[PDB]
């Protein structure tokens, strides 16, 4: 279909791309996966003129970096000069699927220059850094080292090429600022994955999205003691040839806080081939989830398990940002609706959000052991009965059904039956809270009245620990457990890009997102009638909290009212949607941004035609 | 072969057997398994005249007891009378493989009688019980209740049968004492599974087995504040028609401390059919143990794993009683011998003894993760290479071997090789000690110098936690792990009967025991040349500590010097040895003891012929 | 969705249904499966008032009939009377999923009445039967026996119920004719599964469907010496309260040859639950078909197997009726188109049509053996390489790729490469023809030029024998092999109802049918834009032969030009189509027909509202 070599045929000639980022070969957050996945297509486009510049860490170097020798004489001269001038620079390959060249700069070996460099910055942009930050100073050192490397690389080159530099956060924006200060012949791009003030303002300050025009960013930046970081990010965004954000909602947020509209929006992608390695995996995972809920709810298995539906929400334990409270309120409302209308449906909701626990509680392990004992006893009696049936049927006689069971069988089954006696109700949490009084999820569960009662049509299971294949009572990793659920609910409030909903959608699982997140906006823009494809977009930007809860309840109830055929058709449509999130399609925006930067910095040699052409027409 | 109905054809007629024990339907220790396993053959012999009398516990009743109603009018009358006289008695069926009838007595519902009953005992045997014991008072209540039940059962019977009562410890000996006091028409048997003073004297007092004739049992019993318990046990043993012990060494110990030679010795048995459900299982378990030691010793896999031998010792964390110190010293000596003689053998020893830990350490999990990563990478590259080879071979061309590996393969293998880098040596313990300074095993390991060095020919792994199938890094239970080891070393010092060595032998694993344990004495008595069958008996009774360590080192070195064929033949001989430990053969001694009791109590109706008749020696004789 | 209890709420009261057919408990053809599958829903609707009347055969009775006694006194009286009057009648259960009551009549025990009954028929309808038919006489005896049974059942009934009789062919039409002759109080239905003259006229006579109005059925019936059978069928159809056919094309054919338009059309259905037990099964079956074509085409595997498509046609070896010649011509045209346009696609077509063979030929077995040898050698070398890689990677060293292969590996691979040498081209037939000169499929293959050449983009494999799981070289049954194919081509010319295309569609496989068959007409009527759902209907009724071949070539080329995503979407739409062919929906037409018969025969007690309501508009293919 639409591949990289579609219409962007550009005269790259002698051009060098430097992918500057603080998080290459050094796992910290989420852009690490972005760069690691994008390296393959970037190297396919640029060949060997692609370098990733990052800080030097011992752990990362010994784990995933293979040190080599500089392949070009100019690079070797640059490395030798910088190493002899009082620095420490390493070169190698990043042991990832693309195998790109990596330049690693040790910021701990250049403290002596800090007192000088900190002055020079002030003599250039009137930006000062407090001595006690301990994280911005690393950014200053990294930026000065990157500018030094770029200048030396341009000086040592026999024929000077057109250099394109791409900085990825405020941690790397000082290098861009200094590149523009020294008037180096480079083309600068700046990408923001989340505006700095956004996460500060979402928590504490009220109505962040309804006061984007009433925010005096100087005041909030200064009062929170992050004024220098805000100035760094805004200066980096201001003096860049091309400015970019990873989502539309981030584009509005940056246009109102960084005072610059992005020239282009480049969404985050991923490699879908590895995820694709969908009904066989779904069936197996659903069977295992059925076994787990059989074990957990032992002694209370009075509801049909062929009419039960498995919802889930996953991610970091952010109660408001991940929208767990809205999910809980909607679950209570859906429980009331299911009880009132006299339905046979049951809904088991899972909350996989890490918290501060110690171990499992006794009830959960007890239930798993009870289920294992019953399964073993049933298999033993079944095998014995099958052998007896075969033997009695080989002689041409109908089995006397009142003698296939004997004394030890009845003993085993009586012990098994005695095992499943319980007077209490299943717990809503599978672990032991260290802060059970101050936990918000459990507090809301208690407030709204979901105690896994027999009359309740909605059961809730809160599983703090991450899902691991070696766990005693969920011996399965995250992906295979998710493949067996029916729906994923991510009603995010503050979310520049949703990695978890995108991963869920790639696996072929219907999902609920919002228009306050990057993934939700992307899917809303690229699909007509997304609900037919299994994506439910919750209008959370133009609605109140109660209206959002009501709409979520409507979505959940309408999902519960589908037939099995409708659910199958919806899940097939969701499955045929993964190619929209691959770097084979989402990597074209990066190409367009680089072309814009090249044409802006060197208009004599390059010219750009603003082709912004880049899908799912169905129903509506 | 030799079954129950071999020569003991006895006129059982109207006889009732009561198997009195404190530990029926109530799991506490090890005789629970003895009674649970023996119930099947006992019920086959006695039919429905077999009752197990024990205390009433809520947990046991709700877990494994099915309450029923009395099947005979006499039993119903007895139960109703006792329940209306101020007691609480339950009747039921024990949910085990035999399914025997159980009479459960609630000792907490008869505290009001204690002040009376405690007096009556003194008016009968001059035995007092201090009020602060809290465990002997339960024994007194249980004994009085059992005597009450037996008396009422005899009173309510229309035709009086011959009752045989079998008491199993000092906790149940008060009932026997009171049965003999009231001159009831019953035949009493007393079985001791361990003499009370033995475990007290083994720890603290020196040379327990070399001073059995120099012990003034009254003094040691009194000084340890267990004089009343000692008097209870000795009185129960004294006034019994038949006295029994579970082993020969226990027989000498009881003859010298209880002042009565046992009339018979009844060893403990087990059901071998369940254990038999052993070369395929051994191969699979050995492969998994190889994988575990590959993971643990990552970055130091410089020794041949086809020449490595897996020893182990298991049981409760008793450093001296289980003989771990002798094992450690012998391991150090064997390490010196293996290094000096320039051998290619390696010995990995396992110490599975529970201790007080919290979690695994980082190194062990790191090694398991490294092994998993290497296995996954190798399988990925292998599958890719196999697909490419098949494709290139279907077109009739030899594979160009320099192009089957491409960039992402080399990336995966380089990452794995980077992962397998380590500068330190593997740990000797897989957990985090809470008392690492005061641990005796680790202290001795440090003292003798076994740090899993590269030059060391003996590696040591101490795994405190019990082996469980759900463990993160040993996902295997005890039986299936043990089935893959080469030898089990149990040089026990004080051990009335060895359940772990017997279980190991039933599975077909060669083992080392001593003549200071019941299992070792049994195997020494029943086998000629036990070492040919894979049982090495250590002479620990007539030797010093250093001589025992030297003999153990000799045994280990001689085992290490066998060829593979010799080891296979030895393990095959060990496999044909499980039927010696089954209740189908070991249940005949109980029958003989019951016959002796019946003939002693009622000589008019029964007479006993002292037939103490009860195949091994060698196979193919080389010399 | 639409179940049986939807809108036909009818007052059955006391009514008895008799499902008369010559083929109950006696497997002959295809209506056996129809009755066996329909019995479940029919019994659910009618309970125990449902009887199947059929001939008595020893094999069927001993295999699938369980003899019982009459459950009602009237039935017992009827059976006793008929058995004492000179007949032989059996009663029992049919051992099928519904378990319906079966009445079996022995036509061989009533030859004495033939000379009488044959006369009586002439005294009623002026129909004579030649003595040498030997199949119509059985029909006459069966019809007279069925009428006798119905009359006796009505005579012996204490309260007379409303009896509904359903006859299913000309073999059972004499009973209906005699029921109407004797004016019995019964409601008759007649179902025709194929008109008798149709199969005679399709072969030999030209342009059968373009001369339906120019056929003097008396002349063709008389000239073919089947005049008596034709008169039997036409008389049965004429004097029936309700007349039915199994398809629309059969409805026109009967309206023009039997001179009576059907009152209703009842299509054949099946139980889809058993077939459903679709991508995992498809993937596995496609892998096995890939392995088979790898074995067959050894030494010529120069084409991409990830771009090959598997077509097939199955059924009885009727060259013209099953439309094999059109398929072959379209295959040749598609081969020319694929070669001219320089495509990378390959098409392997399968012809599974039984013929008269002896055994496999040498080349096919040779290829299977070669493939097995290559697979074994590759697996051996792969396992050895994986073990060496793991061992060399556990020590932290990159594998020296030039030493992972040694002498015996190269020996095995050289032997395999020598084994894969061939100079000739793969055969088009997997067996040894006994009539290779007179075979039409091979003659047409030779004429059109499909010799499995290297340049040919269409390979052809003709496999006469039925697919069996125990075959040496296709060890798989029909269903699993079909599940792996991409398309099924059934361009039938004469086909009253297509069991094979319907079975293929139930499994979820896109198919090509025609409007000259019952299944094709049904799917055309019930679906809007069937090609979006994977059903390609070929206009063969209003087109010539060459136009049909051109349209089939267009269909095949358009299928070959789809992307993988389009093929996946089409196959999903085909999968969501099986519920249209189930008896849960197709059983309602039988209910409507029975209601019409009851209302026509007994208008006083029953009345029928002519409700003929019984739909797949495309999902989202933007139009």
Numbering used by the authors:
A (entry chain A): 13 to 289, 293 to 629, 637 to 642
B (entry chain B), C (entry chain C): 13 to 289, 293 to 629, 637 to 645
Sentences from the paper on this structure:
The complex adopted a rectangular box shape, with residues 317–349 of GYG1 at each corner of the GYS1 homotetramer. In this structure, each GYS1 active site, at the cleft between the two Rossmann domains, was in a closed conformation owing to additional intersubunit contacts at a minor interface (B–D or A–C). The as-purified GYS1 was highly phosphorylated, representative of the T state and supported by the lack of GT activity without Glc6P. In both the C1 and D2 symmetry maps, strong density was apparent between Arg588 and Arg591 of both GYS1 subunits at the dimeric interface. We modelled a single phosphorylated site 3a (Ser641), which was the first C-terminal phosphorylation site in the sequence. Overall, our model suggests that the nonsymmetric interactions of a single phosphorylated site (3a) at the dimeric (C–D and A–B) interfaces, combined with intersubunit interactions of phosphorylated sites 2 and 2a across the interface, stabilize GYS1 in the inhibited state.
GYS1 activity is inhibited by phosphorylation of its amino (N) and carboxyl (C) termini, which is relieved by allosteric activation of glucose-6-phosphate (Glc6P).
